[PDB]
Amino acid sequence: QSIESAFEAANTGHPVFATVHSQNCSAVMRRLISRFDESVRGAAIYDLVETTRFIMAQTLVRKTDGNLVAAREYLNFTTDIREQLLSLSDMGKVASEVRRLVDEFGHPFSLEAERLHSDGIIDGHVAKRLSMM
Amino acid sequence: PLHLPILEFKTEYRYPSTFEHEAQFKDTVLEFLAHEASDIIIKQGVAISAKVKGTLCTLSTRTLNFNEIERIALWASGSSSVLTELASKKLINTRYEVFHPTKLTTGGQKQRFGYRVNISPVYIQGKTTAEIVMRSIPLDPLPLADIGLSPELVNQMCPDNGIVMVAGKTSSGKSTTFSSIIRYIMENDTPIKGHLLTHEDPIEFVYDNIKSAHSIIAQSQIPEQFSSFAIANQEALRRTPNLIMIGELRDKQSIESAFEAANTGHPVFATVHSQNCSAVMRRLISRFDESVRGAAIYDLVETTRFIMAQTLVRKTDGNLVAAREYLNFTTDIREQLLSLSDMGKVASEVRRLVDEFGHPFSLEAERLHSDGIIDGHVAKRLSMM
Amino acid sequence: LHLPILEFKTEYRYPSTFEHEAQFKDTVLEFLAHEASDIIIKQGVAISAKVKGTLCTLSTRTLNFNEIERIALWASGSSSVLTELASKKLINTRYEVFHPTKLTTGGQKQRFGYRVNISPVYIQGKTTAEIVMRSIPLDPLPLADIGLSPELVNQMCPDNGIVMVAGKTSSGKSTTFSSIIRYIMENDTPIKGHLLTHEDPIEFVYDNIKSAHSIIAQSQIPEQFSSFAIANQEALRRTPNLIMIGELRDKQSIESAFEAANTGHPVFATVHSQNCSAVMRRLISRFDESVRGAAIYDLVETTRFIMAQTLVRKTDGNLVAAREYLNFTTDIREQLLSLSDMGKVASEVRRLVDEFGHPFSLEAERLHSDGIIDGHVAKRLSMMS
């Protein structure tokens, strides 16, 4: 019911900011879809792709200092990306696709870990942990 | 000085030093109303602001203290226990009418503006207050020329049967479009005449002051008179309607019900939350499982007579115009979509068909921009959809 | 001065203000002189009726919410109906008007029968009722008129078990069942004796059906029994040879059907379902998983015959009933029982209707070959239902 209310607020023309307890963007999509039964699950996937504009996953990792930094995956849902997500003939794959697309067009946790690691903000170990997210 | 919301110059009033009385408050309200206000917001933290031209304007830099907002709150609520109720966690929505003395109607008596007033818990500088919000309530259906529609086009939108859909993100534009179309229906000789039911969320528009030779309208409120929209339609079948404003098509059951209504005798006006006509098609089709999806596409193509997506774009001038893309589902179009082989290309092909025979968003932006109304960039965005 | 059309009067002068029921019945009779089919009473406007589809009235004068109160009292079974309206109760009943001037029947008198919706509306800030009465056929229709073969309906009248006709609300299941009962008691059929019908709105009456072997009692279900559950509990207390129950809509209705059938009665049920498989699946879904096995067994064992039916418009422009049906024989039923998985029953039933029944595809083929439906219509029938 929360996810549906977010849908309606979005489609009634309003920015909706929402928090999700998932590890990463793929996990966000999959988790959101899990809420909806198979009978409604097509409609739900279409609503979710059509209304989503942007997905950020965050985690806290240890800086070389010992302080924490927020590493972020994000995918930005351009009209291109959403058009691509809709046209996968099987929607069981949507989540997977998102991953792919995040990898191709977004800022995956691997890329963020490379980026922190190049700036020396992060060790190799937590870099590896973080890419694995 | 500090960053501030915009203040338009006042009309017929000097700003109150402090909000002492409901007549002061009302005078502020109709000053706002001169600066045509979509909505008006009272919060203690900031000066009174209203949504003029879909932006936030404030009349003075002065910021109301909590007692001001308490008084205003008790005026608009009409209940002293308001914050008492707010701790009781009862949600407080009511109506607040303000009458502008000098203005009067075509006939009528005394000019009235309704507001829907929600009073909602907020939390600020460490504790609970109320925020008040007054949404202006549309007065009467606007003439079609007034809202940018030609009598011809709406003639297209007034079939003997089937489904006319208007599509958009915001409810205001749909309510306005369909209310205008219904007033035009009542006032003119048109294929669809007789009993007109509308199943509205907030009954936005009223038809008390629309003269009809041939037609009657019955309006029913969203939650409170009819619990469901399903309930309201199922009962609608019992009401010998000559046109059914169904409300939004959302779930499989809503659009199957719409199919039902159309496939008896009488027109159905539906709104859809999608950006353009192709998007309308694709979205409605989404509601249906693979196995049922063929039958569903057949029903959708055969029942549909006309699809309008509208948006609001900002003209160079400093105002908001409705951009409309529309396709009329004439028998040729319907046959062409039925003549498809995949039948899953119906969305694409509907796009193509809007390009060929409809009014695409690109053409609408080209015509708007060709005239003074919109700049090249907003025209670009408009064509993009 | 703009007005809907008003009739030339036959017999009576319009009341200054509606007070007595006899004025209202007289008005209905005036409308009937003009062969008026439906009547809308609403607050803003004069009492109107649809003559040949077009709205009309007996006077320019509008009605006060008071006389809409009165009229609502008269047409509806219940008293003080507005509180029932604010209780989100759906108020459909039936209303009868006997002809004053000794218009008599083939027998002794002549009566006119009305399906009365009362619906909540919103007028000028206030909740109201709109009333709509649709003249409805009084006597069940012969099989030939609704296109049923005596052989098939004999197929569908067991000594025991459940006969279901499924369909959309606007598909005239009630008509089918009324025809089937009239034929039941007019002909020599396996089912004879005391037949009870429980009808929300009672539509058809059997007062003019002479039977050699059977008596029929009809009970209206809001007004005479508070609930369907109560009426079915009471039905067994009586000595029924056939119980036309309600829609099978929730667990309790389905269970009442189970009880009636298992105490050795034909049970006639409607289901809100597009096809037979869909009927089975829907009924099974009503039960929790813990009880759903038992419920499935009961369902297959008590079912004797399943009809889904649609009204499809035919080449002429009029509409006829397409019917898919399966007869549940001992062999069919036991074959539904003897599955590795019972959750598959629905699927199976699909299969079975294709194999042993009259599927929608076959029905569309045979309608189309005899040139009843246009080919598009046949395709739609085959696609799903």
Numbering used by the authors:
A (entry chain E): 255 to 387
B (entry chain D): 3 to 387
C (entry chain C): 4 to 388
Give the article text.
The dot/icm T4bS system of L. pneumophila is powered by two ATPases: The membrane protein DotL, which is part of the coupling sub‐complex responsible for the recruitment of substrates and their delivery to the secretion channel and DotB, potentially involved in complex assembly and secretion. Here we present the X‐ray crystal structures of two DotB proteins, one from the dot/icm system encoded by the L. pneumophila genome (termed DotBL), at 3.19 Å resolution, and one from the dot/icm system encoded in the plasmid of Y. pseudotuberculosis IP31758 (termed DotBY), at 2.75 Å resolution. DotBL and DotBY subunits display a very similar topology. A DotBL or Y subunit is composed of a ∼150 aminoacids long N‐terminal domain (NTD), comprising 6 β‐strands and 3 α‐helices, and a ∼250 aminoacids C‐terminal domain (CTD) consisting of 7 β‐strands and 10 α‐helices [Fig. 1(A,B)]. The main part of the CTD adopts a RecA fold and harbours the signature motifs of the AAA+ family: The Walker A motif between β7 and α5 (also referred as P‐loop), the Asp Box on β8, the Walker B motif on β10 and the His Box on β11.
Homologs of the dot/icm system are found in most Legionella species, but also in other pathogens, such as Coxiella burnetii responsible for Q‐fever, or Yersinia pseudotuberculosis strain IP31758, responsible for the Far East Scarlet‐like fever. The DotBY hexamer differs from the DotBL hexamer in exhibiting an ααβααβ arrangement instead of the αβαβαβ arrangement observed in DotBL. In DotBY, A, B, D, and E are in the α conformation, while C and F are in the β one, yielding an overall twofold symmetry. Interestingly, the two DotB proteins we have investigated have different hexameric organization, with DotBL consisting of trimer of α–β dimers, whereas DotBY consists of dimers of α–α–β trimers. The DotBY protein was crystallized without any phosphate or nucleotide in the buffer. Nevertheless, when analyzing the ATP‐binding site region of all six subunits, we observed a striking difference between chains adopting the α and β conformations [Fig. 4(F)]. In the β conformation (chains C and F), the Walker A region is similar to what is observed in the bound structures of DotBL and other ATPases, namely we observe an unwinding of the first α‐helical turn of α5 rich in Ser/Gly that provides space for a phosphate to bind. Surprisingly, in the α conformation of DotBy (chains A, B, D, and E), this α‐helical turn is present, formed with the carboxyl groups of residues Ser173 and Ser174 (equivalent to Ser159 and Gly160 in DotBL) contacting the NH groups of Ser177 and Thr178 respectively. With such configuration, a phosphate group would not have the space to bind at this position. Interestingly, in the structures of PilT, PilT2, PilB, EpsE, and VirB11, this additional α‐helical turn of the P‐loop is not observed.
